[PDB]
Amino acid sequence: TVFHKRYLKKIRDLGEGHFGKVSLYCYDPTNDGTGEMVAVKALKCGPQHRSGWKQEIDILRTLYHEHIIKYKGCCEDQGEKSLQLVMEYVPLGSLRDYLPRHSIGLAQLLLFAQQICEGMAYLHAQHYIHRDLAARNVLLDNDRLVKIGDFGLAKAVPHEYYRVREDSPVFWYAPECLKEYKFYYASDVWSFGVTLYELLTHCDSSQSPPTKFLELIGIAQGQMTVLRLTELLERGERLPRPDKCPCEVYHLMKNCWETEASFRPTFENLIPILKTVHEKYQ
Numbered sequence: 001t002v003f004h005k006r007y008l009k010k011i012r013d014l015g016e017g018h019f020g021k022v023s024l025y026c027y028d029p030t031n032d033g034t035g036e037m038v039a040v041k042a043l044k045c046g047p048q049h050r051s052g053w054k055q056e057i058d059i060l061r062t063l064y065h066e067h068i069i070k071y072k073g074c075c076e077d078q079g080e081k082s083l084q085l086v087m088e089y090v091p092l093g094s095l096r097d098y099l100p101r102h103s104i105g106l107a108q109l110l111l112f113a114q115q116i117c118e119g120m121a122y123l124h125a126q127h128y129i130h131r132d133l134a135a136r137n138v139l140l141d142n143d144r145l146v147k148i149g150d151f152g153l154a155k156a157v158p159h160e161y162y163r164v165r166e167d168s169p170v171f172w173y174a175p176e177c178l179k180e181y182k183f184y185y186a187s188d189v190w191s192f193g194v195t196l197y198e199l200l201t202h203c204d205s206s207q208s209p210p211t212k213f214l215e216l217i218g219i220a221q222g223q224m225t226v227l228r229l230t231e232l233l234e235r236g237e238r239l240p241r242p243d244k245c246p247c248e249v250y251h252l253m254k255n256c257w258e259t260e261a262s263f264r265p266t267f268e269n270l271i272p273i274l275k276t277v278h279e280k281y282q
Ligand SMILES: COc1ccc(Nc2nc(-c3c(F)cccc3F)nc3c2C(=O)N=C3)cc1
Pocket: 014, 015, 016, 017, 022, 039, 069, 087, 088, 089, 090, 091, 092, 093, 094, 097, 098, 136, 137, 138, 139, 149, 150
């Protein structure tokens, strides 16, 4: 499907993706206003960013799931000699923005977690890794439905891992990614654990992974932030238990943060577990 540049009326900016800005447009061929509101992502950039942006479109073109953000079409970008990526508009935005301003119950948070896992199980079956599973990339469709966005770092697993570059969300990353630059399917599960930590804190800035890990590491020696993070995690230190987080949920969180990647559950293993834990607290 092809969106014509002439009928796009920009309303406002939505945010910053990995290789580009996301903006809210009204697409109005009629000139009426009935024409739908769409989230449009555009490239900014150097040579290696162009190669990645084309891959992001290629990835998102092929994905189709109720907990992955809907691809709608492409729009030709005469202004950047590029292709702008048109997606569905989720007015509620990310969980990172939403949860600080809305007191969400534990049961509802566990449903979101289940929903994220279902979307990630799908992604892993299509042989893709996400590589920035974080609360900022989980978009709320409505109160009972979340969708995974931003596949800017997403990559095709051929081989059980992808070898990463030296931008990298280190505070959501497993020791193997930080130490050996190998991203496994099990590395996305580590990130999910951190995303689940984020949910149970209501994405409170003061309890955020960067804030909590930099409290542990210190900033007196910034050059060795990643090495100190690596050492801390290999020592078995972990992000604390969020206030009013059930002990069993924190154990699940800890199982996602197992140092050895094979000891972590797959996203298929997690789905039934979260279903049960959800029904418990509902
Ligand atoms: C709360 O204020 C907002 C902010 C952004 C959105 N909307 C969106 N934001 C992203 C987005 C981003 F802007 C940066 C990083 C990661 C993201 F997922 N992606 C999408 C959408 C969307 O509607 N469709 C895809 C809605 C409300």
